[PDB]
Amino acid sequence: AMIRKYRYGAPFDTEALTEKIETAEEAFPYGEISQKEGFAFTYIMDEDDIVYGLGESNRGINKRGYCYISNCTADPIHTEDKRSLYGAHNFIIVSGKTTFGLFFDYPSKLTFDIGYTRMDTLKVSCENADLDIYVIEGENAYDIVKQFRRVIGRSYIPPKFAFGFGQSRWGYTTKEDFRAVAKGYRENHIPIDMIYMDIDYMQDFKDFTVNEKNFPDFPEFVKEMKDQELRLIPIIDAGVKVEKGYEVYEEGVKNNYFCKREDGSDFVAAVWPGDTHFPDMLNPEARKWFGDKYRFLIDQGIEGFWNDMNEPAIFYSSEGLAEAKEFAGEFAKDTEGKIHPWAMQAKMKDIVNSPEDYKRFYHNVNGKKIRHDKVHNLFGYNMTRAAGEAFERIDPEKRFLMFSRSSYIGMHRYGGIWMGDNKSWWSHILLNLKMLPSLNMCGFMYTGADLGGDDTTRDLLLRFLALGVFTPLMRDHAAEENIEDFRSVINARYRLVPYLYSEYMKAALNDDMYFKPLGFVYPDDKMAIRVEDQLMLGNEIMIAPVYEQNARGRYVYLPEEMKFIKFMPDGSISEEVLEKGVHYVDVALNEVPLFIRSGKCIPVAEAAECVKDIDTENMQLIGYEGSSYTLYEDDGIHKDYDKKENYRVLTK
Amino acid sequence: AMIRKYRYGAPFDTEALTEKIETAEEAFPYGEISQKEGFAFTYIMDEDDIVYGLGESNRGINKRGYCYISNCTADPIHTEDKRSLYGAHNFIIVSGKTTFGLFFDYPSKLTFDIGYTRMDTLKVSCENADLDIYVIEGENAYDIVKQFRRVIGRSYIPPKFAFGFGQSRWGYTTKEDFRAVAKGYRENHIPIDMIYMDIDYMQDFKDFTVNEKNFPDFPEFVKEMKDQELRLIPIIDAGVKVEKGYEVYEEGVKNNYFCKREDGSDFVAAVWPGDTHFPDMLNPEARKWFGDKYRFLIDQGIEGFWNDMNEPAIFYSSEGLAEAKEFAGEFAKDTEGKIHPWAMQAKMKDIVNSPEDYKRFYHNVNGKKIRHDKVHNLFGYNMTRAAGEAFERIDPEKRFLMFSRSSYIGMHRYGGIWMGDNKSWWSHILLNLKMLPSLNMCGFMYTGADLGDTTRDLLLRFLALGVFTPLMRDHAAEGENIEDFRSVINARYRLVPYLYSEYMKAALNDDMYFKPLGFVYPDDKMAIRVEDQLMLGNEIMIAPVYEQNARGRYVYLPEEMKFIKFMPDGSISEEVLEKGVHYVDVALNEVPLFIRSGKCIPVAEAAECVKDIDTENMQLIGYEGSSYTLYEDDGIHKDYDKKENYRVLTK
Numbered sequence A: 001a002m003i004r005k006y007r008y009g010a011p012f013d014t015e016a017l018t019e020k021i022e023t024a025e026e027a028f029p030y031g032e033i034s035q036k037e038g039f040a041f042t043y044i045m046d047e048d049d050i051v052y053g054l055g056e057s058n059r060g061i062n063k064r065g066y067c068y069i070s071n072c073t074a075d076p077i078h079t080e081d082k083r084s085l086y087g088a089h090n091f092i093i094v095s096g097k098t099t100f101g102l103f104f105d106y107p108s109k110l111t112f113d114i115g116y117t118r119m120d121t122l123k124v125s126c127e128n129a130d131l132d133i134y135v136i137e138g139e140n141a142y143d144i145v146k147q148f149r150r151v152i153g154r155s156y157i158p159p160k161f162a163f164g165f166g167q168s169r170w171g172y173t174t175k176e177d178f179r180a181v182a183k184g185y186r187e188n189h190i191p192i193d194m195i196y197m198d199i200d201y202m203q204d205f206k207d208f209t210v211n212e213k214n215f216p217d218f219p220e221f222v223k224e225m226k227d228q229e230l231r232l233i234p235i236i237d238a239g240v241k242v243e244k245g246y247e248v249y250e251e252g253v254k255n256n257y258f259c260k261r262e263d264g265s266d267f268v269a270a271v272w273p274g275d276t277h278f279p280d281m282l283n284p285e286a287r288k289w290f291g292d293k294y295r296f297l298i299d300q301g302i303e304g305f306w307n308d309m310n311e312p313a314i315f316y317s318s319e320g321l322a323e324a325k326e327f328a329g330e331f332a333k334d335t336e337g338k339i340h341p342w343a344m345q346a347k348m349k350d351i352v353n354s355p356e357d358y359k360r361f362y363h364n365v366n367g368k369k370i371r372h373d374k375v376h377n378l379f380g381y382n383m384t385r386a387a388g389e390a391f392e393r394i395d396p397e398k399r400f401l402m403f404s405r406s407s408y409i410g411m412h413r414y415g416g417i418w419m420g421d422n423k424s425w426w427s428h429i430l431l432n433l434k435m436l437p438s439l440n441m442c443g444f445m446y447t448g449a450d451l452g453g454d455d456t457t458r459d460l461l462l463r464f465l466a467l468g469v470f471t472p473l474m475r476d477h478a479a480e481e482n483i484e485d486f487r488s489v490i491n492a493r494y495r496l497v498p499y500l501y502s503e504y505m506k507a508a509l510n511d512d513m514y515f516k517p518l519g520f521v522y523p524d525d526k527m528a529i530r531v532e533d534q535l536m537l538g539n540e541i542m543i544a545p546v547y548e549q550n551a552r553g554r555y556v557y558l559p560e561e562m563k564f565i566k567f568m569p570d571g572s573i574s575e576e577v578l579e580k581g582v583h584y585v586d587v588a589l590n591e592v593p594l595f596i597r598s599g600k601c602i603p604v605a606e607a608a609e610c611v612k613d614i615d616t617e618n619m620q621l622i623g624y625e626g627s628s629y630t631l632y633e634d635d636g637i638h639k640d641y642d643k644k645e646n647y648r649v650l651t652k
Numbered sequence B: 001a002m003i004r005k006y007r008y009g010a011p012f013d014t015e016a017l018t019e020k021i022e023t024a025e026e027a028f029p030y031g032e033i034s035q036k037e038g039f040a041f042t043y044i045m046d047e048d049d050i051v052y053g054l055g056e057s058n059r060g061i062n063k064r065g066y067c068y069i070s071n072c073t074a075d076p077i078h079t080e081d082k083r084s085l086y087g088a089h090n091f092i093i094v095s096g097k098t099t100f101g102l103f104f105d106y107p108s109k110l111t112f113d114i115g116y117t118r119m120d121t122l123k124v125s126c127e128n129a130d131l132d133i134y135v136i137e138g139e140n141a142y143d144i145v146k147q148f149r150r151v152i153g154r155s156y157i158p159p160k161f162a163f164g165f166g167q168s169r170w171g172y173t174t175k176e177d178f179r180a181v182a183k184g185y186r187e188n189h190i191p192i193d194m195i196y197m198d199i200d201y202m203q204d205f206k207d208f209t210v211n212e213k214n215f216p217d218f219p220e221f222v223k224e225m226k227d228q229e230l231r232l233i234p235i236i237d238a239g240v241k242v243e244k245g246y247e248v249y250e251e252g253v254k255n256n257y258f259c260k261r262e263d264g265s266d267f268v269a270a271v272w273p274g275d276t277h278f279p280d281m282l283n284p285e286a287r288k289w290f291g292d293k294y295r296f297l298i299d300q301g302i303e304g305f306w307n308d309m310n311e312p313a314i315f316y317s318s319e320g321l322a323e324a325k326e327f328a329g330e331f332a333k334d335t336e337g338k339i340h341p342w343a344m345q346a347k348m349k350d351i352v353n354s355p356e357d358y359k360r361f362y363h364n365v366n367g368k369k370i371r372h373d374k375v376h377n378l379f380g381y382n383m384t385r386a387a388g389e390a391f392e393r394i395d396p397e398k399r400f401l402m403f404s405r406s407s408y409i410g411m412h413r414y415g416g417i418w419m420g421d422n423k424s425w426w427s428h429i430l431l432n433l434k435m436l437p438s439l440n441m442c443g444f445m446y447t448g449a450d451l452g453d454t455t456r457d458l459l460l461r462f463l464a465l466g467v468f469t470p471l472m473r474d475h476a477a478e479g480e481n482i483e484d485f486r487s488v489i490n491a492r493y494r495l496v497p498y499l500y501s502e503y504m505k506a507a508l509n510d511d512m513y514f515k516p517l518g519f520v521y522p523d524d525k526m527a528i529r530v531e532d533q534l535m536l537g538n539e540i541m542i543a544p545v546y547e548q549n550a551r552g553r554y555v556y557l558p559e560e561m562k563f564i565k566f567m568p569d570g571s572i573s574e575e576v577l578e579k580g581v582h583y584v585d586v587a588l589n590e591v592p593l594f595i596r597s598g599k600c601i602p603v604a605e606a607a608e609c610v611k612d613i614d615t616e617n618m619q620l621i622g623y624e625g626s627s628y629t630l631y632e633d634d635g636i637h638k639d640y641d642k643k644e645n646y647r648v649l650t651k
Helices: A141-151 A175-187 A218-226 A247-254 A284-293 A318-332 A341-350 A372-394 A427-441 A458-468 A483-509 B141-151 B175-187 B218-227 B247-254 B284-292 B318-333 B341-350 B372-394 B426-441 B456-466 B483-508
Strands: A003-008 A032-034 A039-044 A050-053 A066-070 A091-095 A099-105 A110-114 A121-126 A131-137 A166-170 A194-197 A231-237 A269-271 A274-277 A304-308 A361-365 A368-371 A401-404 A416-419 A447-449 A475-479 A515-517 A535-537 A541-543 A553-558 A562-567 A573-578 A581-586 A592-597 A601-604 A620-623 A628-632 A647-651 B003-008 B032-034 B039-044 B050-053 B066-070 B091-095 B100-105 B110-114 B121-126 B131-137 B166-170 B194-197 B231-237 B269-271 B274-277 B304-308 B362-365 B368-371 B401-404 B416-419 B447-449 B473-477 B514-516 B534-536 B540-542 B552-557 B561-566 B572-577 B580-585 B591-596 B600-603 B619-622 B627-631 B646-650
Touching: A050 A141, A050 A427, A091 A141, A099 A141, A131 A141, A141 A427, A175 A194, A175 A218, A194 A475, A218 A231, A247 A274, A247 A284, A284 A372, A304 A372, A318 A341, A318 B318, A318 B341, A341 B318, A341 B341, A361 A372, A368 A372, A372 A401, A416 A427, A427 A447, A427 A458, A427 A515, A427 A535, A458 A475, A458 A483, A483 A562, A483 A592, A483 A601, A483 A628, A562 A620, A573 A581, A581 B552, A581 B580, A601 A628, B050 B141, B050 B426, B091 B141, B100 B141, B131 B141, B141 B426, B166 B175, B175 B194, B175 B218, B194 B473, B218 B231, B247 B274, B284 B372, B304 B372, B318 B341, B362 B372, B368 B372, B372 B401, B416 B426, B426 B447, B426 B456, B426 B514, B426 B534, B447 B456, B456 B473, B456 B483, B483 B561, B483 B591, B483 B600, B483 B627, B561 B619, B572 B580, B600 B627
Parallel strands: A166 A194, A166 A475, A194 A231, A231 A304, A304 A401, A401 A416, A416 A447, B166 B194, B166 B473, B194 B231, B231 B304, B304 B401, B401 B416, B416 B447
Antiparallel strands: A003 A131, A032 A039, A039 A121, A050 A091, A066 A110, A091 A099, A099 A131, A110 A121, A269 A274, A361 A368, A515 A535, A535 A541, A541 A592, A553 A581, A562 A573, A562 A592, A601 A620, A628 A647, B003 B131, B032 B039, B039 B121, B050 B091, B066 B110, B091 B100, B100 B131, B110 B121, B269 B274, B362 B368, B514 B534, B534 B540, B540 B591, B552 B580, B561 B572, B561 B591, B600 B619, B627 B646
């Protein structure tokens, strides 16, 4: 009796929540609901109200003052004005004198006008009034989030090695490229556990193949790598190549597993392999077939995968390619200047990720033909759901590394999310920082981010990693000076793996958040609730990364007394007490900073070069003498979660 | 004596400098010069070294750790990976243990690799060793700046009305559109002095025409607005439309005033009007004629212009257009998947503002046909030089508002510049703030920015910056509690006497309007690294909030100051804040600032136009014992020398 479900029309089932809620047959408690123009919820905000949520969305922790459209989009630019990223996360919480959470359970384009049109007005709208709205109430936002976290079911948990460092690069192809990196890191003694394989390892980008000529005994090569504690983490894309004699393709065609055109034919969408077909992720039979395929690589020693282009992205369709050729031909033989160069340009952008192409193909959902656009936001969800179920069939008791580009609430149980770009910008450290608590709100905990890019200067990479240190996914993956600064930073990471791991485990198992906004921890502190460039982690620290070029430090607000801790290259740990108030603090490039809360402590291992070798048996306790910390640890591999003996109390 | 000139090859005379200084004969006094790859300058910086300058460029005040290409581009998205904005201001100061300044007098593509490739390495390189390098010695950066400000000639001084608020909409096209701005502002008591006219008022986009249909009795309409103290500010564009019987064009052809191709034919480039030619801005004769054409508008009661598109922007040439259709052809007829879409797409982008186009036209300069690419950064500057020089012929006694998009050092004598793009971003408020000191260093002090969909909160914070920037406009595209809007604009008007006073004093003394905390607090290791606060003249520090949804921000104070706030109700709050790190509260409808220890400034009652500002009885805000020299003139003419312009105010 603090959670209500309001149903309108005939909502498609997303299986986002795992707890059942009775339909409310009373009045919608807040705002106006209107069905004149599709569906709209309109609400007038108090001046001080903060709006939390929307997981993977643009701008800040407080969403007030802009427009967000939930419409999973393969856009990779990410300017302030972008309305849509890769995530459809329709959770929000109004935080003011009146406080409530709303989850709009809806698979299609959802529109969040949060102060955009009129500063005082919140307006959520969509084309058809076929959705469920959950209303969550409580003390405050954190309490609201915590109930929500309880109904959407438990968050995905990676194996412990996923808490190491990873490196990848679009362009790695041959055994020698991967041999070259193991050598780089291991011989310069940079810690690391994972090496990503970008698309090039396949046989002509064909899903679930390895390049036969570059990889003649993959399992022997996989084992080669596993013997130096390097786990090869290969990519899988939404598109299956159209190739005669390609087995996946042939079973896809034969068993009616790909999405279909209205006319009955298998829909074609050009991606990296050229012409592909999309597996029908909403069809549970097609989902099992595709999930199962991952066995092919699991059977060769592979322990982690990443799914990509699953919005799904489309460079162009057959219809659109043809449409645009006809235009071009018309442009080509204009001389009366009737067809303009920017019209010809505009037709060319318009065939990439075209709303019209998302209306040309269909899902067969338990017998029901649905057009993709009606449910577009669930695709990548289900692609990840597919793999996550295949894992439970092969070995229910084993955790695999899995993370996806596209997501919808409900996926949070089957994998994590990675934030990527086609650009390396200082502003993106801040962006990625602010996104963190918001992902946590909607259940996405194993997340990190990328520096697309060759305008990665040394310092950008250094500060970028110094945030990455605290993000559960931490890698250096891009397209392809002073080596020892890079090492000191990965050292800091590995010194922190045990505590970070423990905080994540305690959080995941308790339906609690990993990263929190200062607002959640200090809700009555009117300064704290406005800080967006600092986060609280677990119940013990606060992070405040440096994100400005040329900066020798930054400003901070401490909502309470804390120990300013830093990891110094020499392996030392500088420690200083700072009163509640505002401070400027020195943080050099190669230095890694966090603040530990009054009467808290955290354990700190010596640096180790891979996760299995971290000496967790006798760690140092940094923080305040007298304080306790509960350390969680298990085998890091399997699902033996509810043991008293996974918890140990440490005292300073 | 403190400035030496190092010449290599046969440099085009850019006329950036008003001073003649002899060619130095010794070897180059700092770093290694290499003429291996063309021309290169290479200097190893100390870790503590800071790098200043470049005026209108990307990123922060300390330029270290990125790459900047001096190459005026009409590129419109101003993301932080971009290495070329509109300006081209080749003036840098290295500041640390070894301090010195460098002006690279080179009219074409110049690359500043400042810590980018390699962090301690400063490398400025260009294709051809044909350029003058000015080396400038000083005790510090501020010093070095002030000497450079001396040799490049005094900065453009604007009419005082140019110090009011201004407004515009790309879209405005009828007498009724403009009357609705007038009524909306004057009825609601929002101060305002200018209405900008964007391109729609021209006859089919033609320079020095007015829309026959929408403005039949134009001088009359200008008088209509002037009487309400609204000065109309029409835009002018580099490209002159190709049109039979359009006199600007007819004259331009007959007299060879346009940029020609190699075969002597007038170059074609498509802009707003479709086919246009570009006035040969480097031909002193063509400049003479182009500038004179402004008389058409001056004679009608117009007192200010802005030049846009003067990079010059090219949507496409005739030649690039045929290449595109060639390629459209190939694409449309491909069946084997030979030509992919991404390639078709690229050829289209590639024909906009093309490198290859700028190798397709020439300037005739004292009988030398010079390829445009080799003097590219000079075009907009010379377009503005033309207008400015024409003003002295057309109405010699009188100051005109004039400001342009693309520039090059030298331009600063003839007009201001404005920064905009097509995006409404928060980070841009900071970009704009950071650019100013840099622009003051290169002579450009009449500057300001645009927010080219803008939210109410963004507008308000944008405007609390523009309060202090000599150019302050809300110029958008298209066309809740307005008391907030008025409050911010009111602070502007209340502060007009002071900012104009500091501008004039700075203009007349080759000093700076805005300075980095560092120039004022050189011995304060904290202060020299501040980038989001500015000193203005000798009395105040500014610090705008540039974060969405914020109630305030952190500031550093290098000395005791009064924290002042212009208040919605019209009051002025005051707090004495000691030296140190603070957090300060600033609501969206509050305009912050800091008066320095030992100092005071004057503030007027809010007034609704620059004319009616009551500058007799004003209050002094600041510290109880200090005095301020207020510079004030008629704000119209060019009599700056008089003892009458100054009067010491004492608190």
